[PDB]
Symmetry: D2
């Protein structure tokens, strides 16, 4: 078939990484959906409702609100505009794309503990329902603990992504990652605190440790910087985006390219285009083998089902792995093994649907329908919802094979079943 | 969690290199898993007593070979009846019943091309008596397997044909023979006479490797515990040979003379069982599994896709077993190809499939006798519980263990597609 | 203490994932920078005093873009480069050779060699350029045309084919076979093929070049923001580091040094990043794969090359000193990407300049006249390498070095490898 | 290459050796791929009534005996001295043509401590006998700890400091205290007979494979010892299990294989030697060198010793060109031993003036000793070149080398042992 010369499949079947590089083809068109999420910073150039709709079409998955600048009234208005542009597509539930809201804090700024503004800003996040928090200048575990105690009673569900932007944060990394929900390689400040020529070492090390831990990792600053004023990026910029994906980053960020630049939609489209190409060029054979050898033995059925499903997906070239999820944990565990198959996550939790964008290859679907009396009937309708959406979005075709990860009883934490299905 | 697990060579199995694996092999690391390599015992004067056969089934005989090179049709029918009587004496407790296959080893073409007249009569005898396997002697080409298949007729279409490679031509035309055969037997006796004796190990290791790749059973035959015909204990070379046949990747090991005419037939079965358990625990699963997958091509067959997914899931949690419901034994055979450390408990209603799956390494067959339940999903769950209960009774499973359960979406063979992680209660 | 620096904990990891996890920002690179820097000479860099501070920063090859400028302008640039290079020839133990590369304008609309290109190639032969960056090579017949235009005298000039269009990428294997090396001309490539596909072309071409043992250059917009700003972007420092990690022998500045406000700063920056990236190379997998892909050879030079590289890894050799006439012996050692330096002691001034195209090869130009006793002349050249290495900080007393030599004079007779202790 | 001929790449299991996986390697094993290289695993033959005849010993040396074992459990000192004299007489009968002379080591296998701790009185007398008679190796029976090896070393005295001590592991304690024994011993013998009595018979293969692996890592010789071709005591042909056992001992990584009873008292002693030689050649060609070498390197620690550094460099160079042999000049045999540790397919040819080193290097797999008799040249470099040419001439005469082949020459920068540091690529003229 033509199939075995599309998503860099000749290069993916190579026996060595050197042979894999030699088999990379510019004419091998990526077919799979773009898995690395795009975080776009919302500013003057992008807070228009009609502009936000354009950005969602372009591939924006997470909207970032930089709390360094702007008032609470400004940020609440930006949030409302994002939600209005997101809900304008809720008329066709088979094509609706959830979009997460992330609050990027100001920072401690030469002081002990959480700054007074950060305490006020985190309460604002709780009161406005932010899905993610990018905690600025995390240096130790206590910093993470402070950002989490700040999310008061009503906000323990918000995902804290610790921003590493100084030498101390890099040295105390393992202790930070243990208590954080993910990490952001905040390259701008990092490139000021540590020598500029050492930042790539910090990026590659942190991405690798995050991949091992199964926790999301974000590449953040100056990725397409020249696109603030120019319609096209530099050769170094497209290389940087592609290399962040190849390193193993779950998310790529635009901050200024979308916040204040002349080409915000073009920067999103560009990051989408590069990410698709870079994801097809990932050497899955070594990546999966190493992921397995490093990942410890688990007696958790969710984790055991995850490798079994990822292995099964590789064996048959599964178009997608469709997993039902309440908290997103099942989808996150599948994501850790970096399958070439899309992780279609079907969920009834609008928050979980937005928060799974932090995990690479997870494509969230929000199930809006009324429940069936028979739980088994309800599970099959949600599985069919993922198939119907996948078909519509081009992820699946009739005749394809899919892996369907489900649980034996309702409620989260009981995933234990994996099925091989033929799309009808 | 589950403290003090220095047993079943787990430190050696977790090594990063094969050299490190060898260095971590421990004589004090006792094997805990059930013996996976089947034992073929040739039935003769020293072993056709019904009470002796009962002793050999307890010792671990899985397949009864009948050497049609000696004995009359009357003698072999009586041997078969004695075997079946000793096998069925344990059918009163179905949770502990062990199926035993009956294989017919032909005399051979001797000095003449094609099937000999006696072989055609002997193959008809096998069909009439209901043998499960046929060890076709002196297979040299694919047309020889076709001749044996034709002699079995229409009724003998379910009988498994294991081609015996015992000459130079059979070794050179191996790939064409394996394609049309159900499995291979490395008939080392005649092979050691046709080709130089110092070259037989190359033929054995090559054929076992190609069989492992193909997913078809391979038998290591002849003189494995030869000194046990007259002595109660084998030589150092003999125990090494049995252990090395298992390490090579052989699905089955054989006794022919040690059990047929010797003074210690039950002791030879017990010895082969003891060595096989030790050798199976010393298999370097890390490289074996990785190489098996890199060589196995991509598959759009749900049975084959579910097989790796289940084997990978079993390795991840150190699953005590992989319980699979099978009609023809194919689902269990596909799991077996990936050589999991977990036991492939294969529950089946087919008494022939139950006997024939002994040719596949690591497949512990169970014969489910109960008639079908009205609700299909309830019948499946009862068969799964039958595997758990048999598994518990036989010491394979304990409460708290994790098992992988391979099932299908509808009745009939060929629809295996589901894998589940269960906790033993 | 030794085991902590030059990313040695990360280099000893058993997996690439474990290698990434062991990368340390406090593990300072100790080795000399192996990836050569090609700096484009323009208005911002043709001053003799500026060229001297560009050689100190780490410029190894001076590029002359024949798209702009007259023959008189380029001859003056050449003279200024040679004047700045020869100003350091007073101390031969510290003298750094600098290659001169001519970048052709290109065929443009023309199917074969353009008239200007034939004139420019003759100019290069007459002026003694070491390298030629042939623009827009699409097939093997294009390389042949450039080779013919160089004539009989230009047979020693290295031809680096620039791949800058779709056809050049598809016909890559036939071009690499007839070329001395390849340049991933990212600028035009990013215009001919989609910008999001250029990294695939770069990584593929670098990989195939590493396998072939032929030099490969990463060329456009590496530190672009340094034309107007004193510091590069996070994407730019990442791009340079990733070009080195991909396996590129040379990194280029074209505009950052040619017309930008910070030409010396761009050279210093590329040097700083390359040292960090070279120490973070996963040598265990790189060497193992290089060996498994490299075919068996009955050539004693090639056989001695792996033997020496393997021996250098075994003892953590500070450097490998090789005596070369044409640079081929040093090039073959370079193919195996050793962590140890490749000190190439040559009497050929052209070979000394041209070996900058090979990663990890540090050229020393021996000038002294030949000794009466052949074995004594060899030992004096070996001692010349040791003395330059000690002076430049590559070697210390107590270190172990691998010494690659031959059994007789003349090129092509390399067959000996020795383990020496620095005294 | 390709221009060495198809017949070259379809022999010595070269298609199977070039496979990318061990499974692919097994699938490419060919019975018609004839071994061409010389047999590298040494054969230790036990000398008894069936083999102490001078003419019989000559037949066994031709068949492939490398080390003669003297079992001190049976026989008197007078009997063993006579056996030694007959061995030396049969060995020296071939010394007329030094380019084809094969050195043969003499090994003393002690009786053992039996039912008592420490060295038995007879063992002290027997060890003194060995020193007085000039034995090259001692197989110390029932070694259980490092202090046992020290006792045997002390009993050999000052003169017996050059005698190699191979500790026999034949009980549970010896297996558990293996690492401390191997550290103080020159090598190990997997004494399977007693081991199969002390530990369960079904566990002996685990002990064998573990000890061989640890010895390969340490670079110290390892011997597989009991019942290898047992049926050949009475029968002219061995069983399928026996030929498999010998082949598997070689594939495990054993430097030496032993005959004890098959050669000592059996009806077919020369036939058992010929059989062990035939199997070893086939098994050596079927060794998967790619994984073996890669793993050996990853486990071997970094070394600042030039002899060790030159050893990998030479072994790697030999694999790259399919070098016919690796000629090394050695005084103590250490240089050849270090090359042997990396298990090259290229036959290591060791040129030495020490007759004891020539005999003792049989303990190292792949080492083919040549005893150089010529007196020293005035010019040191000329003496080295003459010894290198002696290796080439013996190599050509014995069929190891042909004109056109590539060889690797490992030499040193000065006389005296411990100065190996040079590796050269030579073309055979
Ligand atoms: O040893 S290499 O440096 C190399 C080897 C030979 C060459 O010729 C060469 O040019 C480079 N190396 C590159 C990356 N791959 S990879 O398969 O793409 C990969 C595997 C594993 C990774 N983990 C697991 C989670 C991060 C990777 N993260 O980024 N990439 C990863 C492995 C081999
Ligand atoms: O390279 S070896 O010959 C070797 C030999 C001696 C050493 O001291 C050493 O360090 C390496 N070595 C043999 C054993 N395997 S193995 O792990 O046991 C294995 C893996 C894979 C196999 N497939 C996949 C299906 C058959 C094997 N089939 O039989 N065994 C198999 C590893 C490779
Ligand atoms: O019917 P529900 O409550 O949505 O659950 C369907 C199945 O998916 C799961 O909820 C997965 O949830 P989580 O990923 O959040 O752990 C299983 O526990 C459950 O059996
Ligand atoms: O035995 P039933 O009741 O027909 O149930 C079908 C079950 O067995 C299977 O038939 C497996 O059979 P095969 O392995 O012989 O193909 C599956 O479809 C399912 O697990
Ligand atoms: O690298 P090249 O061009 O093959 O030259 C290698 C040569 O180097 C030498 O060491 C130098 O010898 P000369 O300086 O006399 O040419 C020769 O022995 C060997 O042939
Ligand atoms: O293997 P050994 O005993 O350490 O020595 C290797 C020998 O090789 C040599 O080249 C030959 O020297 P000799 O003439 O003293 O034997 C020396 O470097 C060294 O004595
Ligand atoms: O916030 C950021 O992205 C930073 O500091 O680089
Ligand atoms: O059955 C046979 O002939 C054998 O095993 O050699
Ligand atoms: O010519 C070049 O180098 C380019 O276009 O990048
Ligand atoms: O002496 C021996 O060989 C033994 O005991 O095994
Ligand atoms: K901020
Ligand atoms: K140009
Ligand atoms: Mg910041
Ligand atoms: Mg037969
Ligand atoms: Mg151009
Ligand atoms: Mg003993």
């Amino acid at each position: 078939t033509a199939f075995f010369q599309q998503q860099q499949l000749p290069a993916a079947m190579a026996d060595t990484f050197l042979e894999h590089l030699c088999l990379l083809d510019i004419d091998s068109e990526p077919v799979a959906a773009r898995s690395t999420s795009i975080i776009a910073t919302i500013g003057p150039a992008s807070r228009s409702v009609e502009r936000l709709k354009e950005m969602i079409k372009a591939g924006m998955n997470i909207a970032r609100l930089n709390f360094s600048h702007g008032s609470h009234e400004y940020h609440a208005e930006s949030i409302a505009n994002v939600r209005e542009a997101v809900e304008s597509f809720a008329g066709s539930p088979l094509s609706y794309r959830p979009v997460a809201i992330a609050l990027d804090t100001k920072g401690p700024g030469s002081g002990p503990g959480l700054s007074e503004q950060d305490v006020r800003d985190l309460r604002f996040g709780v009161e406005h329902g932010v899905d993610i928090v990018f905690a600025s200048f995390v240096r130790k575990a206590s910093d993470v603990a402070a950002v989490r105690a700040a999310l008061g009673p009503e906000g323990h569900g918000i995902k804290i992504i610790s921003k590493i932007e100084n030498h101390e944060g890099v040295k105390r990394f393992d202790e930070i990652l243990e208590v954080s929900d993910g990490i952001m390689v905040a390259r701008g400040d990092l490139g000021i605190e540590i020598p500029a020529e050492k930042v790539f070492l910090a990026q590659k090390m942190m991405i690798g440790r995050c991949n091992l831990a199964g926790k999301p990792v974000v590449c953040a600053t100056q990725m397409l910087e020249s696109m603030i004023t120019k319609p096209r990026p530099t050769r170094a910029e497209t290389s940087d985006v592609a290399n962040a994906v190849l390193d193993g980053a779950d998310c790529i960020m635009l901050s200024g390219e979308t916040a204040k630049g002349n080409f915000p939609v073009e920067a999103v489209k560009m990051q989408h285009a590069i990410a698709r190409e870079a994801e097809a060029a990932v050497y899955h054979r070594q990546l999966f083998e190493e992921l397995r050898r490093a990942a410890p033995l688990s007696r958790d059925p969710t984790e055991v089902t995850a490798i079994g499903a990822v292995e099964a997906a590789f064996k048959c070239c599964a178009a997608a792995i469709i997993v039902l999820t309440t908290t997103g944990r099942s989808a996150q565990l599948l994501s850790r093994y970096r399958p070439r198959a899309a992780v279609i996550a079907v969920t009834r939790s609008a928050q979980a649907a937005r928060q799974v964008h932090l995990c690479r290859g997870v494509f969230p679907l929000l199930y809006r329908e009324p429940p069936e009396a028979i739980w088994a009937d309800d599970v099959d309708r949600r599985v069919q919802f993922g198939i119907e959406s996948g078909k519509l979005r081009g992820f699946l075709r009739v005749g394809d094979l899919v892996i369907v990860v489900t649980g034996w009883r309702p409620g989260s934490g009981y995933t234990n079943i994996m099925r091989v299905l033929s799309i009808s």
